[PDB]
């Protein structure tokens, strides 16, 4: 069970860190509208 828990915490924190650092990687400039 602990092998499953370590695996899920690698998996979930992989996708949560994709979420967080994705919006830190200049999301508001990824618009088609120019200023």
Partner 1 sequence: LVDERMNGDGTGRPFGVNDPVLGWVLLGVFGTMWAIWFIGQKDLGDFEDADDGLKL
Partner 2 sequence: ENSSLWARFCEWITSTENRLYIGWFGVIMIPCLLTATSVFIIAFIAAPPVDIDGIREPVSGSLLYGNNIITGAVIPTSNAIGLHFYPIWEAASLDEWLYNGGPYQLIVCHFLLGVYCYMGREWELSFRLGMRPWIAVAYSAPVAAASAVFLVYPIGQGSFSDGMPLGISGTFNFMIVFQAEHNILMHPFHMLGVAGVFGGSLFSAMHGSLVTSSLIRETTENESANEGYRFGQEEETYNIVAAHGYFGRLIFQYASFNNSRSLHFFLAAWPVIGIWFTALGLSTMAFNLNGFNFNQSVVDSQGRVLNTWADIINRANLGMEVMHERNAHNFPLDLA
Partner 3 sequence: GRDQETTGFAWWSGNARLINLSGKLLGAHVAHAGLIVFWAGAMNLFEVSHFVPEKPMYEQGLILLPHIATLGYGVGPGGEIIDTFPYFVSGVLHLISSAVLGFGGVYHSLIGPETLEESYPFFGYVWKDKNKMTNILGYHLIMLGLGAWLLVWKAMYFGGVYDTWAPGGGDVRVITNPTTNAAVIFGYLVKSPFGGDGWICSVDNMEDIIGGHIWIGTLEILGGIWHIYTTPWPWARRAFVWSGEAYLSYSLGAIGVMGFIACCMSWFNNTAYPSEFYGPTGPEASQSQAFTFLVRDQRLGANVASAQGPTGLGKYLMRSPTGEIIFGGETMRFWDFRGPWLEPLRGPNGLDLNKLKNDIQPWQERRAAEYMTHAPLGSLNSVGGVATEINAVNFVSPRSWLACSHFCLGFFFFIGHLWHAGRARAAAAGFEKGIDRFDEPVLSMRPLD
Ligand X SMILES: CCCCCCCCCCCCCCCCCC(=O)OC[C@H](CO[C@@H]1O[C@H](CO)[C@H](O)[C@H](O)[C@H]1O)OC(=O)CCCCCCCCCCCCCCCCC
The residue ranges that bind partner 3 (CB under 8 A) are 23-28, 31-35
CB of 15 to partner 3, least distance (A): 19
Rounded to the nearest 5°, which phi and psi values hold at 23? -75, -20
Our finding on whether 13 is near partner 2 (CB under 8 A) is no
Our finding on whether 10 is near partner 2 (CB under 8 A) is no
Q: Is the dihedral of CA 15, 21, 23, 28 positive or negative?
A: negative
CA distance 23 to 17: 10
Judged by CB under 6 A, the residue of 6, 8, 11, 20 near ligand BCR is 20
């Amino acid at each position: 069970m602990l092998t499953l828990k370590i695996f899920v915490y690698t998996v979930v924190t992989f996708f949560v860190c994709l979420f967080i650092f994705g919006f830190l990687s200049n999301d508001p400039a990824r618009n088609p509208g120019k200023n």
